[PDB]
GROMACS .gro file of C-alpha atoms in nm:
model
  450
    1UNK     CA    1  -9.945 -17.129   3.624
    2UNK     CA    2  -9.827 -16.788   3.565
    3UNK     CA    3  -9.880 -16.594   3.234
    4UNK     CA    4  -9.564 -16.467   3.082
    5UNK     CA    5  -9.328 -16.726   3.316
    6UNK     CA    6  -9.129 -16.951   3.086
    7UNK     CA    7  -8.766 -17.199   3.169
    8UNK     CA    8  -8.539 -17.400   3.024
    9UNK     CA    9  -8.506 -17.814   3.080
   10UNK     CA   10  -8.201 -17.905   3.204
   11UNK     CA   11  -7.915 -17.833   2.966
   12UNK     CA   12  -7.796 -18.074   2.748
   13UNK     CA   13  -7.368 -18.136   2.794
   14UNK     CA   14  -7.326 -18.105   2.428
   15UNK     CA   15  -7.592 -17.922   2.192
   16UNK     CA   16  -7.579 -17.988   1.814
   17UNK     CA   17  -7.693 -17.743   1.536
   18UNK     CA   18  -7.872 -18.020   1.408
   19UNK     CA   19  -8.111 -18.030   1.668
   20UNK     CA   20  -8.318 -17.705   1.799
   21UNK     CA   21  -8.432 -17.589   2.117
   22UNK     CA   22  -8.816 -17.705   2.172
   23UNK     CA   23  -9.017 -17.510   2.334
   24UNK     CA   24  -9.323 -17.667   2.485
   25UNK     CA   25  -9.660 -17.498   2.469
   26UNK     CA   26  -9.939 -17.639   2.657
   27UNK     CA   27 -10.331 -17.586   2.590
   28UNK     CA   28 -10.663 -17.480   2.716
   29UNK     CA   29 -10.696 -17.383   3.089
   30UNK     CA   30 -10.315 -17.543   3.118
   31UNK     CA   31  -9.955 -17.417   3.214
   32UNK     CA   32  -9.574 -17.539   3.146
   33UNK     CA   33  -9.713 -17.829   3.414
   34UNK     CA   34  -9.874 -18.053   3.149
   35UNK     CA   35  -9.522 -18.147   3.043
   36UNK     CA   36  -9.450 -18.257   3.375
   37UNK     CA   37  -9.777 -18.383   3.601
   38UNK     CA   38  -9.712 -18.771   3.565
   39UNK     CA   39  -9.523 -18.673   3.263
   40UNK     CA   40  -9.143 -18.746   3.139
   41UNK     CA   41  -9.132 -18.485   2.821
   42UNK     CA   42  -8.810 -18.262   3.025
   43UNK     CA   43  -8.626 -18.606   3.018
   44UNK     CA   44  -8.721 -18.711   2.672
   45UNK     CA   45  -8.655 -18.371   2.518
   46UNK     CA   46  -8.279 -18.415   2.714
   47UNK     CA   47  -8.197 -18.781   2.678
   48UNK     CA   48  -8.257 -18.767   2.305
   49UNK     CA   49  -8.012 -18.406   2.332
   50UNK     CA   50  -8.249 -18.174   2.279
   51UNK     CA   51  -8.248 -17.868   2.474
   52UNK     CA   52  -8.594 -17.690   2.594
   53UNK     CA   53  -8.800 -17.419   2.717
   54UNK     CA   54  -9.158 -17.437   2.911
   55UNK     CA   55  -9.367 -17.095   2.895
   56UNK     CA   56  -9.703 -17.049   3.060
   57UNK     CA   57  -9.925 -16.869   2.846
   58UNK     CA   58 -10.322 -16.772   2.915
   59UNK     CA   59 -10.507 -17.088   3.023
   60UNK     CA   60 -10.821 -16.843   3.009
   61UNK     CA   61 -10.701 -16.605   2.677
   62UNK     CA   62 -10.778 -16.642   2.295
   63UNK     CA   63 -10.504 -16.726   2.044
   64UNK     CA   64 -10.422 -16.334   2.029
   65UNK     CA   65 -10.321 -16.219   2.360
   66UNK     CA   66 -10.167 -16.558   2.389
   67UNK     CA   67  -9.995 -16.531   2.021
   68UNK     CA   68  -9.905 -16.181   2.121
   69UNK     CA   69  -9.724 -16.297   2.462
   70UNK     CA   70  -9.581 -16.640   2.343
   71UNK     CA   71  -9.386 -16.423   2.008
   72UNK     CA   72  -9.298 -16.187   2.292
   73UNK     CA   73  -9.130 -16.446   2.502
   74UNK     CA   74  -9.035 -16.623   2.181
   75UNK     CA   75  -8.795 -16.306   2.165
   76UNK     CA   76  -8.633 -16.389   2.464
   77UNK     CA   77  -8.589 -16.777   2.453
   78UNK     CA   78  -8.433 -16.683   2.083
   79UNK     CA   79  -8.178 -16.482   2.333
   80UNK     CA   80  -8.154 -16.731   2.559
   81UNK     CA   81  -8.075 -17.049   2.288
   82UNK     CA   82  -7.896 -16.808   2.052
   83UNK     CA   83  -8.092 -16.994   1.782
   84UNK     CA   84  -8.419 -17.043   1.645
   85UNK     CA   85  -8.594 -17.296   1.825
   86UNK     CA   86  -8.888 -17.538   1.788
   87UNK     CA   87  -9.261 -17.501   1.928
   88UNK     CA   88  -9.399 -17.843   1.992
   89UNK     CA   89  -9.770 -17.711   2.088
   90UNK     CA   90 -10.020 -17.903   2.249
   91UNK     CA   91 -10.417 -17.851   2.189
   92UNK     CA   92 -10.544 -17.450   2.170
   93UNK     CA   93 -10.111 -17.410   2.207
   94UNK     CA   94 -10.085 -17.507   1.872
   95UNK     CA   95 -10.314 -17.216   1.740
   96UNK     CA   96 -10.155 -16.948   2.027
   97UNK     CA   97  -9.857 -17.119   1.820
   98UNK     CA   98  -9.977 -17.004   1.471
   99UNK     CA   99 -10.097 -16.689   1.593
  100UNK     CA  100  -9.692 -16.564   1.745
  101UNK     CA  101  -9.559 -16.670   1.444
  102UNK     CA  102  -9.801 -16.538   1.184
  103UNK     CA  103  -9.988 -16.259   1.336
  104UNK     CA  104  -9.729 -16.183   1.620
  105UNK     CA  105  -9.421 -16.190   1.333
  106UNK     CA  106  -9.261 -16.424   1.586
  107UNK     CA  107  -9.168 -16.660   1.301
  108UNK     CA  108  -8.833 -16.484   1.315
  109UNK     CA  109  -8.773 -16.707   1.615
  110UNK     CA  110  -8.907 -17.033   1.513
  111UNK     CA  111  -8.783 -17.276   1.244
  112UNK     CA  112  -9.108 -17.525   1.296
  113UNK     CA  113  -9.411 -17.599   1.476
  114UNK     CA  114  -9.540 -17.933   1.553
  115UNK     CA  115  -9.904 -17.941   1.682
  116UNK     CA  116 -10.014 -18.239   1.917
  117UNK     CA  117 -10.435 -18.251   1.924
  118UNK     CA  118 -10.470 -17.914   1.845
  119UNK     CA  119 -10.813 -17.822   1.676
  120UNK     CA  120 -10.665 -17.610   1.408
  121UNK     CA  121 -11.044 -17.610   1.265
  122UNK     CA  122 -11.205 -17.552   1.602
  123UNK     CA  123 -11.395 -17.767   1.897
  124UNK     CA  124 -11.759 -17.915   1.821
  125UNK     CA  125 -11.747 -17.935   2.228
  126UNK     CA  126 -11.709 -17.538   2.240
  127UNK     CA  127 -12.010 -17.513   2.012
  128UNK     CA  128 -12.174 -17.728   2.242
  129UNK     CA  129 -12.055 -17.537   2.571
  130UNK     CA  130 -12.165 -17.222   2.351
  131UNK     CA  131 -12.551 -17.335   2.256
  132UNK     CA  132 -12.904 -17.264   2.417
  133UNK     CA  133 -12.909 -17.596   2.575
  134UNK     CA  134 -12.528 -17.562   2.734
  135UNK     CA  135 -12.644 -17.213   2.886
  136UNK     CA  136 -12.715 -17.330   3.232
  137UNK     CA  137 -12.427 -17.551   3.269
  138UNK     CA  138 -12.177 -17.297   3.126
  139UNK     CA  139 -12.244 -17.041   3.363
  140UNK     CA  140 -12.186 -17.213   3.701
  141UNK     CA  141 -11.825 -17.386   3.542
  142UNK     CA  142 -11.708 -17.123   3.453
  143UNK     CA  143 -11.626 -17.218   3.118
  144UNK     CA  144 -11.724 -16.932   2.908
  145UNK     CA  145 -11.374 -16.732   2.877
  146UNK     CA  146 -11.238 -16.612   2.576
  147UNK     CA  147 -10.993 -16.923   2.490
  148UNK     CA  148 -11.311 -17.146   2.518
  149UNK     CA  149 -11.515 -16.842   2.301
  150UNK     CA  150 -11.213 -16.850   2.012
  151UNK     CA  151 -11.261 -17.270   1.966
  152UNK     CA  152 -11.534 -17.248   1.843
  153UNK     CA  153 -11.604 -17.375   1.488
  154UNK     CA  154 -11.735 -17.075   1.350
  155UNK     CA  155 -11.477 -16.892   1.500
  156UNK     CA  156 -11.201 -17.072   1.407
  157UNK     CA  157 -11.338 -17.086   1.060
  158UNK     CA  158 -11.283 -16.714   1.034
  159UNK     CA  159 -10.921 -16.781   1.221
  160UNK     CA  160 -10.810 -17.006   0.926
  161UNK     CA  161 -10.957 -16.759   0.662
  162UNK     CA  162 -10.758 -16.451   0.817
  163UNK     CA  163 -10.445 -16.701   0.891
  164UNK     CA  164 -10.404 -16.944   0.590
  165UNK     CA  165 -10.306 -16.732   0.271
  166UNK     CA  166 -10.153 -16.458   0.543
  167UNK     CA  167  -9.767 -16.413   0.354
  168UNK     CA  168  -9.604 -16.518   0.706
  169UNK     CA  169  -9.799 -16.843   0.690
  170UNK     CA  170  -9.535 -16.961   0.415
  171UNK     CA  171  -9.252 -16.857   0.648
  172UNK     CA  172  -9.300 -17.187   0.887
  173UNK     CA  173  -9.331 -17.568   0.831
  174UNK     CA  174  -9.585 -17.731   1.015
  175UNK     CA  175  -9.671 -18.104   1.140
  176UNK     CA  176  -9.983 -18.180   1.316
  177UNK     CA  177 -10.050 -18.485   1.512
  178UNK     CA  178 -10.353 -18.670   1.583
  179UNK     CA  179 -10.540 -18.920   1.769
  180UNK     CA  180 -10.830 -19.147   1.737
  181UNK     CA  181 -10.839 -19.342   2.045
  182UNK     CA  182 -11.148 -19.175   2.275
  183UNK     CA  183 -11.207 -19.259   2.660
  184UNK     CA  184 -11.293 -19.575   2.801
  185UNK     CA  185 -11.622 -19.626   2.948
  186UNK     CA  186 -11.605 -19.436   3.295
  187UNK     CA  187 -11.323 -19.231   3.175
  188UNK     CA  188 -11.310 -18.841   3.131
  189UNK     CA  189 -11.274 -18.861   2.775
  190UNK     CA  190 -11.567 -19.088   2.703
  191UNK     CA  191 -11.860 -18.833   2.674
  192UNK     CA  192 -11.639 -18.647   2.457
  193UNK     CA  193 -11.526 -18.920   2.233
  194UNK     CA  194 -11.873 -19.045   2.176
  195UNK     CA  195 -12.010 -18.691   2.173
  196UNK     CA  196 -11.726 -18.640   1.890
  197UNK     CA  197 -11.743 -18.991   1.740
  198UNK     CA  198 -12.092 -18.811   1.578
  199UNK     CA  199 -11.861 -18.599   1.373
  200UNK     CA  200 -11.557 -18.855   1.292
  201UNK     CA  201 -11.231 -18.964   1.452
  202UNK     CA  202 -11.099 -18.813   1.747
  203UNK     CA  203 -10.943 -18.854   2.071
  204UNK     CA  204 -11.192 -18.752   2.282
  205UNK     CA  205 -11.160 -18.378   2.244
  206UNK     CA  206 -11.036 -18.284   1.878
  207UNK     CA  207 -11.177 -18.437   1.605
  208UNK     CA  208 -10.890 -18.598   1.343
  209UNK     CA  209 -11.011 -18.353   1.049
  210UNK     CA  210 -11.030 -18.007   1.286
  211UNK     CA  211 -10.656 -18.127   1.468
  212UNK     CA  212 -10.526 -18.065   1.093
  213UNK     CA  213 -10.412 -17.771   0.822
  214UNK     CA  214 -10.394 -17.803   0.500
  215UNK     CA  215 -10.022 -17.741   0.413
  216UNK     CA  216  -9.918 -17.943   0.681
  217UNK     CA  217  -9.723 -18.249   0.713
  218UNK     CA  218 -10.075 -18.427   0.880
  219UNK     CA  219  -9.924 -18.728   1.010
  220UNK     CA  220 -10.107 -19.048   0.988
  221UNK     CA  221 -10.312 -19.056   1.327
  222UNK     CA  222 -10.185 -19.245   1.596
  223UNK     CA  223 -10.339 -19.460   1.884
  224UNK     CA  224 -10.379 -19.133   2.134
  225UNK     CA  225 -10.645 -18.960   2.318
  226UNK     CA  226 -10.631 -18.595   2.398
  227UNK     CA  227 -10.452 -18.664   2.776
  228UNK     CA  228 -10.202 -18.960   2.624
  229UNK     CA  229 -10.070 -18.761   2.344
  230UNK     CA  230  -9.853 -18.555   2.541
  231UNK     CA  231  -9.680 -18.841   2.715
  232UNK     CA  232  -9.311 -18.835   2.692
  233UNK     CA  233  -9.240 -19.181   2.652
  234UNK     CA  234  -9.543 -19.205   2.410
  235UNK     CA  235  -9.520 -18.916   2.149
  236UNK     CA  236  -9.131 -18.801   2.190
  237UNK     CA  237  -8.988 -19.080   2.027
  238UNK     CA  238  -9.308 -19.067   1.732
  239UNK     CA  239  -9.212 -18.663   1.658
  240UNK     CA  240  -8.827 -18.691   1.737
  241UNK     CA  241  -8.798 -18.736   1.342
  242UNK     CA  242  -9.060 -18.421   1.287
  243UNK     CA  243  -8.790 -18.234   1.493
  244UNK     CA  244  -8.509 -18.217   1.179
  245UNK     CA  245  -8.696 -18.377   0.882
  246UNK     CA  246  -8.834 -18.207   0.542
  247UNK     CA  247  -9.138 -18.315   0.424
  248UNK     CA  248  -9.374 -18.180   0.242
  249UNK     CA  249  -9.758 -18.137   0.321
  250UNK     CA  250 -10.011 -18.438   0.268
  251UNK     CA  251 -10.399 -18.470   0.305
  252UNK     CA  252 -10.544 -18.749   0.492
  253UNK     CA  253 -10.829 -18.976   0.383
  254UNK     CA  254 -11.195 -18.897   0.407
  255UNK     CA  255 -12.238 -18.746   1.052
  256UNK     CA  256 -12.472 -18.832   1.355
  257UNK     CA  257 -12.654 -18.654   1.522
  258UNK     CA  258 -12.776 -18.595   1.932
  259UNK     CA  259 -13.099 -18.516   2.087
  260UNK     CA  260 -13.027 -18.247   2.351
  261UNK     CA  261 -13.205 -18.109   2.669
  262UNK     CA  262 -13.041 -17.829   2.922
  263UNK     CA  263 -13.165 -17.651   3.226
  264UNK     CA  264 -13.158 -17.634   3.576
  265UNK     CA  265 -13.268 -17.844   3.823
  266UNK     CA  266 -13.329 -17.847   4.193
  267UNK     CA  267 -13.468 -18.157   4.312
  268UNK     CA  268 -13.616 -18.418   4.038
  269UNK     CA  269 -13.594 -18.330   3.646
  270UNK     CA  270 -13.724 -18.571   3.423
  271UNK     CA  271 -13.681 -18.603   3.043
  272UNK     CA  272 -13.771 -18.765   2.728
  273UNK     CA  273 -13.712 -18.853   2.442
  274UNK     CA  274 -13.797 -19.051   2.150
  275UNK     CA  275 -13.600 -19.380   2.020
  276UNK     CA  276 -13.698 -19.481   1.679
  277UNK     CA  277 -13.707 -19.839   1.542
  278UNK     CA  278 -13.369 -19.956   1.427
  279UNK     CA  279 -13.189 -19.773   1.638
  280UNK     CA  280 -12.825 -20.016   1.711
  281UNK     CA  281 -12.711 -19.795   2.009
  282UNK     CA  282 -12.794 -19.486   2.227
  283UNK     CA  283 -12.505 -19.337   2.492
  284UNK     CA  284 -12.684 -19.158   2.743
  285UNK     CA  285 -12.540 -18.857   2.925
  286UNK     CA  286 -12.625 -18.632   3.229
  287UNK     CA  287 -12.406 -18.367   3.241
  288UNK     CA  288 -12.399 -18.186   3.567
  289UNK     CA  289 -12.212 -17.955   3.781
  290UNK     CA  290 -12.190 -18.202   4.089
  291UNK     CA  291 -12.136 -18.567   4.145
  292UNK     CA  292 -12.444 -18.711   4.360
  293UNK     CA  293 -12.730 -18.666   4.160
  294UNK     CA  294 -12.932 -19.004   4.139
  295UNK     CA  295 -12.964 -19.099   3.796
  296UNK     CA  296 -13.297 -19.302   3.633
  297UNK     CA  297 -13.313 -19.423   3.306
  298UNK     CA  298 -13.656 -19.563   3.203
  299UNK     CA  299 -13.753 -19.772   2.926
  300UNK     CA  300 -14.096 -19.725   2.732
  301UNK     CA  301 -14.233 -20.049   2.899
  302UNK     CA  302 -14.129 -19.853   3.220
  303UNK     CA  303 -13.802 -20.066   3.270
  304UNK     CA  304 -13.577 -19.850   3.499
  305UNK     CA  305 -13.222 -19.854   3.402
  306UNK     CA  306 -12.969 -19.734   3.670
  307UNK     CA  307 -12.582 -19.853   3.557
  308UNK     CA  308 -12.477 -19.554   3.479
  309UNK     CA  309 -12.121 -19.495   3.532
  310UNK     CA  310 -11.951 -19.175   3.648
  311UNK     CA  311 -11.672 -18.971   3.546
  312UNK     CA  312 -11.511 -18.601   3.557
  313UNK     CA  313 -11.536 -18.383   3.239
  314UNK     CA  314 -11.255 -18.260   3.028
  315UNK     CA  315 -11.112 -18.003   2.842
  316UNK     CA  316 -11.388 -17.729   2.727
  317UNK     CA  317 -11.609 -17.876   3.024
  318UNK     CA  318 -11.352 -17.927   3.284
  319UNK     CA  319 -11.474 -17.876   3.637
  320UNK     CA  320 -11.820 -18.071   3.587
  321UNK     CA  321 -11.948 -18.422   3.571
  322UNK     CA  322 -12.089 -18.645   3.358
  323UNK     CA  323 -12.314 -19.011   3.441
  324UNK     CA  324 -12.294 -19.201   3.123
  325UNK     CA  325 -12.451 -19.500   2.973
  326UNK     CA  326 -12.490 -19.669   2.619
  327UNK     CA  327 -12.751 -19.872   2.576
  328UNK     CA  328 -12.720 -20.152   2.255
  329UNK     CA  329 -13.061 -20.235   2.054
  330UNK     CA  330 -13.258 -19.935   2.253
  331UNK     CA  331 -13.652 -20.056   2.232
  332UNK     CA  332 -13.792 -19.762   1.996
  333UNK     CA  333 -14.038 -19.500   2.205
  334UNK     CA  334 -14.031 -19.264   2.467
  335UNK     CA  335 -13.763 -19.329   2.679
  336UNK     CA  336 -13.686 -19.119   3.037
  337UNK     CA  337 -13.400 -19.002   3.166
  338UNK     CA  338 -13.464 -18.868   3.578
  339UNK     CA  339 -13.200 -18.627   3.799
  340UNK     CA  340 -13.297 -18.665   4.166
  341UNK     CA  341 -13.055 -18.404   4.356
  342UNK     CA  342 -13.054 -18.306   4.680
  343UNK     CA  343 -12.861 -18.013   4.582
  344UNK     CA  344 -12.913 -17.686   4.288
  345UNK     CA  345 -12.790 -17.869   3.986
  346UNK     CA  346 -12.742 -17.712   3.585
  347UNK     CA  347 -12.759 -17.987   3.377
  348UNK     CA  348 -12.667 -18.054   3.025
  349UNK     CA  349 -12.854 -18.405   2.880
  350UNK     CA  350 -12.741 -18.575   2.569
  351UNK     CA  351 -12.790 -18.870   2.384
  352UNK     CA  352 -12.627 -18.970   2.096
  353UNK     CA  353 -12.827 -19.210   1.846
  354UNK     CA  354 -12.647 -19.546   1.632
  355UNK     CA  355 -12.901 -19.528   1.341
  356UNK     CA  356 -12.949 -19.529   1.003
  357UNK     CA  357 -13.186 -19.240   1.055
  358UNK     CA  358 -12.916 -18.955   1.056
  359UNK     CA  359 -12.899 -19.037   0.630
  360UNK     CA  360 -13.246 -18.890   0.664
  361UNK     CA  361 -13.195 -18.651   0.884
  362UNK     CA  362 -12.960 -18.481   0.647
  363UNK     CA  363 -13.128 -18.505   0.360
  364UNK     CA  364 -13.448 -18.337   0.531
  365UNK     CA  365 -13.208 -18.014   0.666
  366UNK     CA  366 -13.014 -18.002   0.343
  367UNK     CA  367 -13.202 -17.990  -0.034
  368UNK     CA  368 -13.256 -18.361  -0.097
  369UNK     CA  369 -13.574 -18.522  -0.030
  370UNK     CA  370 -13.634 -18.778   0.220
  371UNK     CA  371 -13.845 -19.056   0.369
  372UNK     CA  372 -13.931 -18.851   0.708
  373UNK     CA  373 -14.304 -18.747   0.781
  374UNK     CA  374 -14.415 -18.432   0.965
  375UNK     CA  375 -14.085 -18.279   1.015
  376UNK     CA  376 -14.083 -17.951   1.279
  377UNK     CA  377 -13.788 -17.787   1.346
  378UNK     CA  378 -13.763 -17.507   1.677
  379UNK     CA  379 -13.472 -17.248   1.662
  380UNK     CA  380 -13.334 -17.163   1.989
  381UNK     CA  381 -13.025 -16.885   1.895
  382UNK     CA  382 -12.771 -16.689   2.063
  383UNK     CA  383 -12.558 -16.411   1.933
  384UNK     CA  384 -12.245 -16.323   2.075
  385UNK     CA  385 -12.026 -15.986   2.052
  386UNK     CA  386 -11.615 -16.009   2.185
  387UNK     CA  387 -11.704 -16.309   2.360
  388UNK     CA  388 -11.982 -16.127   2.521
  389UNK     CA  389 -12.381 -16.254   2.511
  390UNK     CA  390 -12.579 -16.019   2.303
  391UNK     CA  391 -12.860 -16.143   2.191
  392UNK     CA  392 -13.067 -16.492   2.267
  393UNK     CA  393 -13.400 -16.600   2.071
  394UNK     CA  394 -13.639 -16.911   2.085
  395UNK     CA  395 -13.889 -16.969   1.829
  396UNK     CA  396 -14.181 -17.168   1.821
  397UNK     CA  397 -14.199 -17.526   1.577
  398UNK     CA  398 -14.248 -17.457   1.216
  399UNK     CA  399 -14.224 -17.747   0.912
  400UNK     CA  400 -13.838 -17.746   0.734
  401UNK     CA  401 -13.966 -17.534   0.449
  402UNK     CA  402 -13.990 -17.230   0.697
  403UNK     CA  403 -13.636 -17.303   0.848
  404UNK     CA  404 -13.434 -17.180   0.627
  405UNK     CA  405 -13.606 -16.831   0.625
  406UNK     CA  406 -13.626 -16.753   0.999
  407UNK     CA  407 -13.235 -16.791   1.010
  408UNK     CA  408 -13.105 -16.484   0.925
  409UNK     CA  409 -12.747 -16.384   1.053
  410UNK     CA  410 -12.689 -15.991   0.935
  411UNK     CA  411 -12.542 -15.860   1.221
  412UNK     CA  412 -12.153 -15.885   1.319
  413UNK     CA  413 -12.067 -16.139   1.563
  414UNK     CA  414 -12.031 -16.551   1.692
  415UNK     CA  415 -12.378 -16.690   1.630
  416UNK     CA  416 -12.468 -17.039   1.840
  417UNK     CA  417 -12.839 -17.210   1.625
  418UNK     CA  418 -12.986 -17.427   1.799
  419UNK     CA  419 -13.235 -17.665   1.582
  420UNK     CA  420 -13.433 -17.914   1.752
  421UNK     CA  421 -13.636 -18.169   1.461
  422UNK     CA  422 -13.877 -18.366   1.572
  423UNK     CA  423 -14.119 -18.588   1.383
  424UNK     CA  424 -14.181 -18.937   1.196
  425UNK     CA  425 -13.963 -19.186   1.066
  426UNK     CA  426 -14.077 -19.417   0.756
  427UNK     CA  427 -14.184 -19.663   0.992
  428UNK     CA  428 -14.379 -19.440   1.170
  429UNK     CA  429 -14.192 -19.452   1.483
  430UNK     CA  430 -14.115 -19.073   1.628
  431UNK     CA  431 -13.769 -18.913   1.618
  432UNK     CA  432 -13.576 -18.639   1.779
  433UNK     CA  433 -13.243 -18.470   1.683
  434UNK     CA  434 -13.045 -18.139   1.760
  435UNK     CA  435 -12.817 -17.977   1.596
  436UNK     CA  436 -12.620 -17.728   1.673
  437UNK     CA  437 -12.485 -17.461   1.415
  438UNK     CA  438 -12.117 -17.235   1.496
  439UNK     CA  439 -12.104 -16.947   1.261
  440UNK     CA  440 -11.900 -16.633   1.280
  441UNK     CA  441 -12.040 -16.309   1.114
  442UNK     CA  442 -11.745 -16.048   1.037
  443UNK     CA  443 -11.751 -15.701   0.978
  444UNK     CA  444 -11.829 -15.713   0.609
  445UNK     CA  445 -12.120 -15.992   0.663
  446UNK     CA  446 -11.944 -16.247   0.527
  447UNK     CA  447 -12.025 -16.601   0.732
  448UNK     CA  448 -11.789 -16.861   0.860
  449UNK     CA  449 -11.907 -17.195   0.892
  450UNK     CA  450 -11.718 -17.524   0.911
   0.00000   0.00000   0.00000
């Protein structure tokens, strides 16, 4: 779009006090066009007499420059409407959203905000895009700008610390929407619901929990994924009532992990990776920057596997590609997974695991003691500064008991941790997992982790 550029929907014949102006606010790497690309919102807003107002904000900025230009314009659709209007904020909108009205004192122009898939609590697929493994592939998308940097978990951590006992925060009623349904298989938003489904709900980009605030109205999820909940026909008519009504704020009701590769390649890359016994179901993904890589998936009888399936990536990994597969009852070994490009490829791999291995995994990271034999654990790290690499270390294997010392996080600044734990299961079959750690370091050295 065009930073800065807002306009009104067409006007409604007679407007009633009773009903606000909305003003739509789309989200990461978007403009005012998300409410219109194969998309009816204008006409729902005006056939249910509403009046509205489309701004284009950053698709590339954090929540501050795009808080401070969205209360600036705020200012002038207030003019324009003569009346305080509505923000109905879609994805990273939703936090721009908070950020005019709290931090941007543009809550003087705003009676509510209702969110729609906006991770309030951060992205786990920034953290990703963020982490050793994700370095290569980040680069040549593109996808390391500062609205990407500021949804990160850590980050946004810090964001709700600094934002949720703020006096202005009291000012505004909020309502956050929701959704749970991911991708279908060979659909955009399949790696990321299944990358997500690790963590809990979600609809394929937000998880359920981090699309929330706590003295919101958190309605009930609904049967959306990230692209469908902004669908006129769908979600109008479901936060038409969220428009006028007062409610008051309500909780909803109450962890897997991945085995993770990254690099580049340019001609074959193989990789692999262990599958323990018991395992009900791997997905498979090769994340890549292009589309004709051949794609080999091998079995530990030597079995070659080839149906993967194809299909653009979304949201904090828009502009790549992704050849997915999920595999039910995975034979337990050392699997393969081979790239064959004829062209330079960066490539992200990622496998998530069905098992009842991730109780153990847990317990072996966290205090508890568990069944798992021979447990290493490798710390790859990067440390950013205003969105800014400033620091990157790798350290060699070392049992759990040494883990906890070698992460230190002193210094100021958006730490990605890498921890990659191999070993044996209680059936002695080998295991691999990585997880990935978002925490923000502030001033003070106080540390924000979700």
């Amino acid at each position: 779009g065009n930073p800065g550029y807002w306009f009104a929907g067409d006007p409604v014949e007679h407007p009633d006090p009773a009903k606000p102006p909305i003003v739509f606010v789309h989200g990461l790497n978007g403009s005012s066009s998300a409410w219109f690309d194969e998309n009816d919102m204008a006409e729902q807003a005006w056939k249910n007499g509403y009046d509205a107002a489309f701004i284009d904000l950053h698709p590339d900025k954090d929540m501050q420059d795009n808080g401070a230009m969205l209360a600036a314009k705020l200012r002038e659709i207030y003019q324009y409407f003569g009346r305080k209007v509505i923000l109905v904020s879609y994805s990273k909108g939703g936090i721009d959203s908070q950020s005019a009205l709290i931090h941007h004192n543009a809550y003087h122009y705003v009676e509510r905000v209702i969110t729609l898939g906006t991770p309030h609590h951060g992205s786990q697929l920034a953290d990703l895009a963020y982490s050793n493994w994700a370095g290569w592939l980040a680069d040549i998308l593109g996808q390391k700008n500062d609205a990407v940097y500021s949804l990160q978990t850590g980050f946004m951590k810090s964001f709700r610390d600094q934002t949720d006992n703020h006096p202005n925060r009291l000012k505004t009623k909020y309502f956050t929407l929701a959704g749970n349904k991911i991708g279908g298989f060979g659909s955009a938003l399949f790696f990321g619901g299944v990358y997500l489904n690790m963590f809990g709900e979600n609809d394929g980009a937000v998880t359920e929990k981090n699309a929330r605030l706590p003295y919101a109205t958190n309605l009930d999820t609904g049967k959306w994924d990230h692209f469908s909940i902004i669908k006129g026909n769908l979600t109008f008519p479901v936060f038409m009532p969220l428009l006028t009504i007062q409610a008051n704020a309500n909780e909803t009701a109450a962890l897997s992990y991945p085995f993770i590769r990254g690099g580049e390649n340019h001609g074959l890359r193989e990789e692999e990776f262990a599958v323990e016994k018991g395992v009900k179901e791997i997905t498979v993904h090769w994340l890549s920057n292009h589309s004709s890589g051949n794609i080999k998936l091998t079995d530990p009888r030597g079995k070659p596997f080839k149906d993967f399936s194809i299909a653009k990536t979304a949201d904090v990994f828009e502009g790549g590609f992704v050849h997915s597969a999920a595999i039910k009852n995975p034979a337990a070994g050392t699997w393969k997974i081979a790239s064959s490009v004829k062209q330079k490829e960066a490539f992200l791999f990622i496998v998530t695991f069905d098992s009842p291995l991730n109780q153990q995994i847990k317990n072996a990271v966290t205090r508890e003691s568990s069944n798992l034999a021979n447990v290493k654990a490798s710390v790859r790290s990067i440390r950013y500064e205003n969105g800014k690499q400033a620091e990157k270390k790798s350290l060699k294997p070392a049992s759990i008991n040494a883990l906890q010392n070698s992460l230190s996080f002193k210094k100021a600044g958006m730490y990605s941790v890498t921890i990659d734990l191999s070993g044996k299961t209680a059936d002695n079959s080998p295991f691999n997992r990585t997880i990935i750690r978002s925490i923000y370091v502030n001033d003070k050295g106080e540390k924000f982790e979700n």
